[PDB]
Amino acid sequence: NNVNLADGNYVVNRGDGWILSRQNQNLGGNISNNGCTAIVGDLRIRETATPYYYPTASFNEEYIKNNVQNVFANFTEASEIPIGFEFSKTAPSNKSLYMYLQYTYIRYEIIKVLQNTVTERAVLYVPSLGYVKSIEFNSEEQIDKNFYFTSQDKCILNEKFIYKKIDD
Amino acid sequence: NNVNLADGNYVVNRGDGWILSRQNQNLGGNISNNGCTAIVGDLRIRETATPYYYPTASFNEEYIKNNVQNVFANFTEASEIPIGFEFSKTAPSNKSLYMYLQYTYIRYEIIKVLQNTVTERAVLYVPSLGYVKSIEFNSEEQIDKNFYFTSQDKCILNEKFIYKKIDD
Amino acid sequence: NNVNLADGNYVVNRGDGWILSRQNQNLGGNISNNGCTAIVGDLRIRETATPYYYPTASFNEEYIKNNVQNVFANFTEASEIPIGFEFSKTAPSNKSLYMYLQYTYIRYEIIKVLQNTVTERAVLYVPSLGYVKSIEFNSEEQIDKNFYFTSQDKCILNEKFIYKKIDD
Amino acid sequence: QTILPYPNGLYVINKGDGYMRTNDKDLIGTLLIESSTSGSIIQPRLRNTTRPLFNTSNPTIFSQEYTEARLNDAFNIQLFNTSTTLFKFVEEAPTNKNISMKVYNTYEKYELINYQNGNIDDKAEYYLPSLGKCEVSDAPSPQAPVVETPVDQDGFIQTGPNENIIVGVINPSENIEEISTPIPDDYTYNIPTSIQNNACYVLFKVNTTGVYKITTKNNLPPLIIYEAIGSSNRNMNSNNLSNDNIKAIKYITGLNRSDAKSYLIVSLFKDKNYYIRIPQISSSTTSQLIFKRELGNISDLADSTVNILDNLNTSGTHYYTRQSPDVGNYISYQLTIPGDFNNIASSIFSFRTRNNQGIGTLYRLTESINGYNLITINNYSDLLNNVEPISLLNGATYIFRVKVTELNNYNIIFDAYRNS
Amino acid sequence: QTILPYPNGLYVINKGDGYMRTNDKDLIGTLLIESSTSGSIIQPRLRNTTRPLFNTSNPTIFSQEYTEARLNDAFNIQLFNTSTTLFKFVEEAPTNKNISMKVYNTYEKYELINYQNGNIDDKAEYYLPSLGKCEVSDAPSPQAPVVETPVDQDGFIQTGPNENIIVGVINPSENIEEISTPIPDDYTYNIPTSIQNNACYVLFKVNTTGVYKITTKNNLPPLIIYEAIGSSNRNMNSNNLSNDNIKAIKYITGLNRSDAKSYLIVSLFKDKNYYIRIPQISSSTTSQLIFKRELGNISDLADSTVNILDNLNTSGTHYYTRQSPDVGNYISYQLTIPGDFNNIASSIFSFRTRNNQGIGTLYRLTESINGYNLITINNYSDLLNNVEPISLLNGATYIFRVKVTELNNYNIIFDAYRNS
Amino acid sequence: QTILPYPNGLYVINKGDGYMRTNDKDLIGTLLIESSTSGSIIQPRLRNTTRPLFNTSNPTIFSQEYTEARLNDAFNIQLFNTSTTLFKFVEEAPTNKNISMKVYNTYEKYELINYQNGNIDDKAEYYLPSLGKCEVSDAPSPQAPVVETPVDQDGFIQTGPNENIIVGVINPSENIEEISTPIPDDYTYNIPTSIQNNACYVLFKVNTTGVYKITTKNNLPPLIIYEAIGSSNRNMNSNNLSNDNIKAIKYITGLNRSDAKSYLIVSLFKDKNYYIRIPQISSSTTSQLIFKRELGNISDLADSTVNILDNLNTSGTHYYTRQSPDVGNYISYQLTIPGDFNNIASSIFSFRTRNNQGIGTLYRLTESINGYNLITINNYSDLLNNVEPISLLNGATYIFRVKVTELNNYNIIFDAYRNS
Ligand SMILES: CC(=O)N[C@H]1[C@H]([C@H](O)[C@H](O)CO)O[C@](O)(C(=O)O)C[C@@H]1O
Ligand SMILES: CC(=O)N[C@H]1[C@H]([C@H](O)[C@H](O)CO)O[C@](O)(C(=O)O)C[C@@H]1O
Ligand SMILES: CC(=O)N[C@H]1[C@H]([C@H](O)[C@H](O)CO)O[C@](O)(C(=O)O)C[C@@H]1O
């Protein structure tokens, strides 16, 4: 929780590749076998690509939005233009392949700091792209709970901390 | 024509992969050569995917429809959602490839039986997917009539006989 | 400039694959690296596929159009139907790939001749398809001016001279 | 200009795929694909509208709409200027050479003909938009010399595989009578008075698979019989013919020549539907269609018109001109030779054909054992100017079967030479 | 019919992907892919509309809309009958054999249950449209014999990987109280009068990570405590609980049985949000929620209900029936054995369980050093019909911890046998 | 801050592709592609709208619309905020490692400048939406330490290949005169009175390919000549210049400095169209444009301004400051040295440049043989502080040609030193 920077408010890019807790399988999954190539994708548009604001007393949604879109990517303007992504994997011979899709996100924070630690923190998740997990299976095989389910938000890439001081 | 089951009326799934007589080349064909990959496909929707009812005195179209859609797939509900299929083949080096497409169908029957044979039979063909035949050729080569033309309805897969008794 | 044919007016197909001066990079370009497959394409429709008429005193646009479309392809009727083309290339390992797209054209001429040379000439460029040039690069590498820029109209295929006499 | 061995009527011929107009009139475009690059041309059906082409010899009768209705009768073409089918061509160029990809629109050529007495009286050509053609080759040198070449003749060229599928269709200006009840071994059908005004078809099926003799009363007029294409399988009821309004028909045997007094010997199957075309008869007295199941070896004639030969009391030349069957198929002739029956051989006979070559089998027809029987008298390898005499018993009935082996002319001519 | 080791309430269980109806009710279709050919079936989302399936045991309470609201609480499913996701299957057939490609629509099965006293009182099944199933195999012989087989029972089959993810959700007919200020080491919360009318949850967090004793005044009623799933990270303020309205909850410990006088010993973490469910209390006098930070080895009990055992002055059988914890988890019992405290061992005790097997640890609870302390007296490998006597000092307080090892029954029964 | 060796006017410079804003402002997103998996990011143009970026130094003159009109003049850019082009990136991860795919939108940077006396007076930057950038690398460890790094400066970075294509465009506030008739070997064009109010261009072509002397009456003002880019091929008529309204122009030679009395020696080609810019002349007496075909070796000067050097009767320093040609190109100086012509060498001359280095060739200009002739007197390898004396005949006319070899300054300075 320690942060080595001066007193004041900051907007920070925490990076791409964040996935959210409990929504692992919301988009569904895909089953194939015996050398079949399975493909899953999505053309994200505004009606299915919803940003998640977790605001705070001093930092409301409009405040998060304007400061993020001024320094980093304007996700409102970008949302008007459909963009596709897809993943493919070939099922192995004589075995079955399961493959499920979930949205990835850019995590943004707006933090207040007193020179030792973050005092306040609002969070914004902007829809980015997607991520597939796959597993080989058969009907008799039990598999790890944690494959299907993420209990805490995490980043499948390396986390980042790129900062700008608001009202310097 | 013999059928080993009790007296009464039945709805029966005769399987997928049926092709219809005299409509082999209705969708057209495709010509390629010299290592080219040729692809043909179709996004079947309601305006080009027409079911064929061949009804009978006791079994009219609405009677065929309702009994098929209650036991087997609801093809009316399914028809509202576009679905694509395509085939591809690479033309050989220094030779030409011809490739033609035709719709495949699920064949359904509604049969009346007296304990030795089918007394009555209505038929329904529901559009399923498609099937390509291909042939290598040159301008001088004559080829079999039966390649271009199917005179009697047949199934390119194994035929099935999955039955349910109507009004048990 | 010499042309071995009788006195009179002619419509002539100069072939496919013509590219126009100074518009090399109008459609933009594409950058990839490290074994990535880059794809660029276009579904040409009427709003982005504009013909270029360079008419003359005796041969106006309507005169060029009608005589070309009577003998050769009716490009007005063809323009109503969207058609796609695309190119792909895999970027090399540990190097960057640049790839840019430009429209190709059928060049048509209507020429007046006096039995030694072409006295008059109107030109029509009909949008055909497209053409990609690619180059491997790094940030420090200088590259030929002529890669980015065509100063005079040329044909990337062999030029043709297929003629018909107007009003014989 | 080939011989069409078919009776009068309407035919839709699929003359193949890969047709396209000359002078790059159907060129979509050309891609230059550089080495180690892939190129692709797509028809993605973002619009469903297609552009069929059509030509006709008589636009009032064979109009586009009329031709389309026949194409539907024949091949069940549903949609003529809308498609949801896509086609695409993809090609990677090798590491060493550039490649040229030329893509064209193409058509399937359907030909509608009105065929009368061996002539095409009316002709329409319908070009159904198809799924394209791609020609790839080594990229041409841009420095290649420019050859001044004249624009070639306006029309079509065929770039697809050879094809000629002929399908007969019911003439929709001729009424269809239906015998709903599958006919028993012996059936007589009274021809209604509408036959006075135009020809008609009678749709029927047989109760029991077998060989049948089909004829009018007094063996005139001649009959034509077809099979409904694709009627097998499909809907069915016990004692009722299931009409699916199938108008695509396959010619079996029969002819149009009005003086050809005859009957048909045909192998008919229970699971099929058949059409008999009865020509217009201007008489005021009712005609009949007579069906008679035949057991025994008269099945040797199966699928054949049996022409009854008349006025043979004179000696020498006796010609009979008839529509030739196709190569491999039968035409037959029945002969009751003149004179009273004891066991004297009547003025020796010699049998030959004139236009078309054929095998030839002579049978004596047994009249009243318990049903008819054929006794093979002699076979002939070639019939064209054949002169192997044979002595037939006066008063006896003989049948000569010709299996055609070369089709030089629309008509086959048969000569029963009566020698001494 | 498995034992669900959870308290009363609402649960949404994801029972896995790859569900589909029987009798090819979800078959998209089959491609026959010839050797050296590729075949593909695409769901391109040209329409976004999907068709979820739904069944319910009571349609008035567990309506589709209500079930959807719970699925949102649990998994944050946003869209129930619209999708922009595509799926596609592609397969090239080998050079030697043809291949069959069968593609189906599939669903994820979500199950909403109202769980009361170890029974499912209300049950709804929501089938969320998923991203399909493809089965490829060698193309079947078209000459294969046709086996007449009856249509099998109407319903679903599962073709995806085994899955059973249980997520508790807040009962939305029970109000949520919030302690906005992160609680200090010692906190007392006055339960408002609305508790007279229905149960409630109290949302809170701790200021300092540690082990805590949670109990009502006089240890009745029993409490249940859950953790909010996914509350970590996310928004934060110094001295203020950040509510993100997270309604997905993970059960920690506690039970419903109304006579189970008890307290909770739970390991709570600063970065998390917790929910305590206080049941309905019909009394007119105010009840309190007491939090007390515990230092020292009472943490051995961490995440356990501690059941206070009453009326043990009689000797022999002393049964106590309680909701069994899951395999690997704790249930604990506090015993102040009868008699006055000197150092005489009170009528020897023997400890056993009845339904479920478990490990078992006996501690003496030190009362007043400087904070509480547990001294391990003895461990027991198996508890089911265990009869190893132990002599406890009269007037002393002992705690017996059971770590469950086999879950045969919803309830675990504990017997404190008082021997002589 | 490079030297632009061009005359005054408007220029559109394509400064390359692959431009993108800092701080991931143009990031579409990142895919983590697991081993043995393919990942893909698509821009499918389901909407055609694009978002060009634009900055300007003066928004009233160089407005977005004005800049777009210049981009059209230069490169024929048709559509500025709509595209039908698609781009896609596909990548399979190896069996052993995961891969990261980062995709960005990109732009082509076009720069519009108003260039006056070696300064940029007005500057606009137009960023045309391009076909993207993909960066793949080994997937980063999710456990990688988080380095706190400041957001870097707002602006663009270039990630595409180095490019700097300069294209001049006609100043659309200056009228274009056209000589429709291809000029013969000798032509005189009367400059209309509008030249009093602003500069103009005269569009023309030559009847016969050759070298030409172009000058005003009395050699003032100086002229600039350009070539129309892409005018070759295209429409044509016998004795008529075909205007295609091509406004993209390539500078050949000429300069703006108002006191530079001169003429042009240029190699002009029959199949091209040329533009001469005549500056504003405020005089009330009519000026003329004089074309004169030159046979013979005055072609050595081909594409050069020939500066007539004045007031050289004094001895020593004689500087002349002129717009420097680019490396490899010519600037020339004509000298009629003072004194009466017999055969005495006039006060020895020494020739040097001051700012820019160059080769240097001294010719004596023959006046009246039958047309002009150049006799090479001497060459000089380097011109910067060159002091090799040469004795020229008084009254004779000499031409000194400088081929530039290093471009240090916008202006090249020429010194004709008159020694004794
Ligand atoms: C009454 C009769 O039997 N007429 C037959 C005649 C003569 O027998 C033949 O011309 C003389 O040899 O020939 C035909 O007209 C003929 O050429 O086909 C057929 C006709 O059936
Ligand atoms: C007052 C008291 O302590 N009652 C306990 C009783 C008796 O002790 C037991 O039935 C006799 O052995 O048992 C329970 O009802 C039980 O079965 O769970 C629990 C209850 O806490
Ligand atoms: C009348 C004349 O010829 N003037 C020339 C003068 C002088 O000769 C020079 O300054 C003295 O050496 O120089 C320029 O102004 C100069 O610097 O470019 C150019 C001009 O052409």
Coordinates of N, CA and C in Angstrom, one line a residue, chain E residues 232-318:
Chain E
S232 N -12.1 -7.2 -2.1 CA -10.7 -6.8 -2.1 C -10.3 -6.0 -3.3
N233 N -9.2 -5.3 -3.2 CA -8.8 -4.3 -4.2 C -9.9 -3.2 -4.2
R234 N -10.2 -2.7 -5.4 CA -11.4 -1.8 -5.6 C -11.3 -0.5 -4.7
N235 N -12.4 0.2 -4.7 CA -12.5 1.5 -4.0 C -12.3 1.4 -2.5
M236 N -11.8 2.5 -1.9 CA -11.3 2.5 -0.5 C -11.3 4.0 0.0
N237 N -11.6 4.1 1.3 CA -11.4 5.4 2.0 C -10.9 5.0 3.4
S238 N -10.2 6.0 4.0 CA -9.5 5.7 5.3 C -10.3 5.1 6.4
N239 N -11.3 5.9 6.9 CA -12.2 5.4 8.0 C -13.6 5.3 7.5
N240 N -13.8 4.5 6.5 CA -15.1 4.3 5.9 C -15.2 3.1 5.0
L241 N -16.2 2.2 5.3 CA -16.4 1.0 4.5 C -16.9 1.3 3.1
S242 N -16.2 0.8 2.1 CA -16.6 1.0 0.7 C -17.6 -0.1 0.3
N243 N -18.8 0.3 0.1 CA -19.9 -0.5 -0.4 C -19.9 -0.5 -1.9
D244 N -19.7 -1.7 -2.5 CA -19.9 -1.8 -4.0 C -21.1 -2.6 -4.3
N245 N -22.0 -2.7 -3.3 CA -23.2 -3.5 -3.4 C -22.9 -4.9 -3.9
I246 N -21.9 -5.5 -3.4 CA -21.5 -6.9 -3.7 C -22.5 -7.8 -2.9
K247 N -23.3 -8.6 -3.6 CA -24.3 -9.5 -3.0 C -23.9 -10.9 -3.1
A248 N -22.8 -11.3 -3.7 CA -22.3 -12.6 -3.7 C -21.5 -12.8 -2.4
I249 N -21.8 -13.9 -1.7 CA -21.3 -14.1 -0.4 C -20.8 -15.5 -0.2
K250 N -19.6 -15.6 0.5 CA -19.0 -16.9 0.8 C -19.2 -17.2 2.3
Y251 N -19.9 -18.2 2.6 CA -20.1 -18.7 4.0 C -18.8 -19.0 4.7
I252 N -18.6 -18.5 5.9 CA -17.4 -18.8 6.7 C -17.8 -19.8 7.8
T253 N -18.7 -19.4 8.7 CA -19.1 -20.3 9.8 C -20.4 -19.7 10.4
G254 N -21.1 -20.6 11.2 CA -22.3 -20.2 11.9 C -23.4 -21.1 11.4
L255 N -24.6 -21.1 12.1 CA -25.7 -22.0 11.9 C -27.0 -21.3 12.2
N256 N -28.1 -22.0 11.8 CA -29.5 -21.5 12.0 C -30.2 -22.0 13.3
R257 N -29.9 -23.2 13.7 CA -30.6 -23.9 14.8 C -30.8 -22.9 16.0
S258 N -32.1 -22.6 16.3 CA -32.4 -21.5 17.2 C -32.0 -21.7 18.7
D259 N -31.8 -22.9 19.2 CA -31.4 -23.1 20.6 C -29.9 -23.3 20.7
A260 N -29.1 -23.1 19.6 CA -27.7 -23.3 19.7 C -26.9 -22.1 20.2
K261 N -26.9 -21.9 21.6 CA -26.3 -20.8 22.2 C -24.8 -20.9 21.9
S262 N -24.2 -19.8 21.4 CA -22.8 -19.9 20.8 C -22.2 -18.5 20.6
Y263 N -20.9 -18.6 20.2 CA -20.2 -17.4 19.7 C -19.3 -17.9 18.5
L264 N -18.8 -17.0 17.7 CA -18.0 -17.3 16.6 C -16.6 -17.0 16.9
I265 N -15.6 -17.8 16.5 CA -14.2 -17.5 16.5 C -13.7 -17.5 15.1
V266 N -13.5 -16.3 14.5 CA -13.2 -16.2 13.1 C -12.0 -15.3 12.8
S267 N -11.2 -15.7 11.8 CA -10.1 -15.0 11.4 C -10.6 -14.0 10.3
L268 N -10.5 -12.7 10.6 CA -11.0 -11.6 9.8 C -9.9 -10.8 9.3
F269 N -10.0 -10.3 8.0 CA -8.9 -9.6 7.4 C -9.3 -8.2 7.0
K270 N -8.4 -7.2 7.2 CA -8.6 -5.8 7.0 C -9.1 -5.4 5.6
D271 N -8.6 -6.1 4.6 CA -8.9 -5.7 3.2 C -10.2 -6.3 2.7
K272 N -11.0 -7.0 3.5 CA -12.2 -7.7 3.1 C -13.4 -7.0 3.8
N273 N -14.6 -7.3 3.2 CA -15.9 -6.9 3.7 C -16.6 -8.2 4.1
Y274 N -17.3 -8.1 5.3 CA -18.0 -9.3 5.8 C -19.5 -9.0 6.1
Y275 N -20.3 -10.0 6.1 CA -21.7 -9.9 6.4 C -22.0 -10.9 7.6
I276 N -22.7 -10.4 8.6 CA -23.2 -11.2 9.6 C -24.7 -11.2 9.5
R277 N -25.3 -12.4 9.4 CA -26.8 -12.5 9.3 C -27.3 -12.7 10.8
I278 N -28.1 -11.8 11.2 CA -28.8 -11.9 12.5 C -30.2 -12.3 12.2
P279 N -30.6 -13.5 12.8 CA -32.0 -13.9 12.6 C -33.0 -13.1 13.2
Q280 N -34.3 -13.3 12.9 CA -35.4 -12.6 13.5 C -35.4 -12.9 14.9
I281 N -35.5 -11.9 15.8 CA -35.8 -12.0 17.2 C -37.0 -11.3 17.6
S282 N -38.0 -12.0 18.1 CA -39.3 -11.5 18.4 C -39.4 -10.7 19.7
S283 N -38.4 -10.7 20.5 CA -38.3 -10.0 21.8 C -38.6 -8.5 21.6
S284 N -39.0 -7.9 22.7 CA -39.2 -6.4 22.7 C -38.1 -5.7 23.4
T285 N -37.1 -6.4 23.9 CA -35.9 -5.9 24.5 C -34.8 -5.9 23.5
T286 N -33.9 -4.9 23.5 CA -32.9 -4.7 22.5 C -31.8 -5.7 22.6
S287 N -31.4 -6.3 21.5 CA -30.2 -7.2 21.4 C -29.0 -6.5 20.9
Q288 N -27.8 -7.1 21.2 CA -26.6 -6.4 20.8 C -25.7 -7.4 20.0
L289 N -24.9 -6.9 19.1 CA -23.8 -7.7 18.4 C -22.5 -7.2 19.0
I290 N -21.8 -8.2 19.6 CA -20.6 -7.9 20.4 C -19.4 -8.5 19.6
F291 N -18.4 -7.6 19.2 CA -17.2 -7.9 18.6 C -16.1 -7.8 19.6
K292 N -15.2 -8.7 19.7 CA -14.0 -8.7 20.6 C -12.8 -9.3 20.0
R293 N -11.8 -8.5 19.8 CA -10.5 -9.0 19.2 C -9.9 -10.0 20.2
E294 N -9.3 -11.1 19.7 CA -8.7 -12.1 20.6 C -7.2 -12.3 20.2
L295 N -6.3 -12.0 21.1 CA -4.9 -12.3 21.0 C -4.7 -13.7 21.6
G296 N -3.6 -14.4 21.2 CA -3.3 -15.7 21.8 C -3.9 -16.8 21.1
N297 N -3.7 -18.0 21.5 CA -3.9 -19.3 20.8 C -5.4 -19.8 20.7
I298 N -6.3 -18.9 21.1 CA -7.7 -19.2 20.8 C -8.0 -19.2 19.3
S299 N -7.0 -18.6 18.6 CA -6.9 -18.7 17.1 C -6.9 -20.1 16.5
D300 N -6.5 -21.1 17.4 CA -6.6 -22.5 17.0 C -8.0 -22.9 16.5
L301 N -9.0 -22.2 17.1 CA -10.4 -22.4 16.7 C -10.8 -21.6 15.4
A302 N -9.9 -20.8 14.9 CA -10.2 -19.8 13.8 C -11.2 -20.4 12.7
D303 N -12.3 -19.7 12.5 CA -13.4 -20.1 11.7 C -14.0 -21.3 12.3
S304 N -14.9 -21.1 13.4 CA -15.6 -22.1 14.1 C -16.7 -21.4 14.9
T305 N -17.9 -22.1 14.9 CA -18.9 -21.8 15.9 C -18.6 -22.5 17.2
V306 N -18.6 -21.8 18.3 CA -18.3 -22.4 19.6 C -19.7 -22.6 20.3
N307 N -20.1 -23.9 20.4 CA -21.4 -24.2 21.0 C -21.3 -24.4 22.5
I308 N -22.0 -23.5 23.3 CA -22.0 -23.6 24.7 C -22.9 -24.8 25.2
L309 N -22.4 -25.7 25.9 CA -23.1 -26.9 26.3 C -23.8 -26.8 27.6
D310 N -25.1 -27.0 27.7 CA -25.9 -26.8 28.9 C -26.4 -28.1 29.5
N311 N -27.0 -27.9 30.7 CA -27.6 -29.0 31.6 C -26.9 -30.4 31.6
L312 N -25.6 -30.4 32.1 CA -24.7 -31.5 32.1 C -24.5 -32.0 33.6
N313 N -25.4 -31.6 34.5 CA -25.3 -32.1 35.9 C -25.7 -33.5 36.0
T314 N -26.6 -34.0 35.1 CA -26.9 -35.4 35.0 C -25.7 -36.1 34.3
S315 N -25.6 -37.4 34.5 CA -24.5 -38.2 34.0 C -25.0 -39.1 32.8
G316 N -24.0 -39.5 32.0 CA -24.3 -40.3 30.8 C -24.5 -39.6 29.5
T317 N -25.5 -40.0 28.7 CA -25.7 -39.4 27.4 C -26.0 -37.9 27.5
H318 N -25.3 -37.1 26.6 CA -25.5 -35.7 26.4 C -25.3 -35.3 24.9

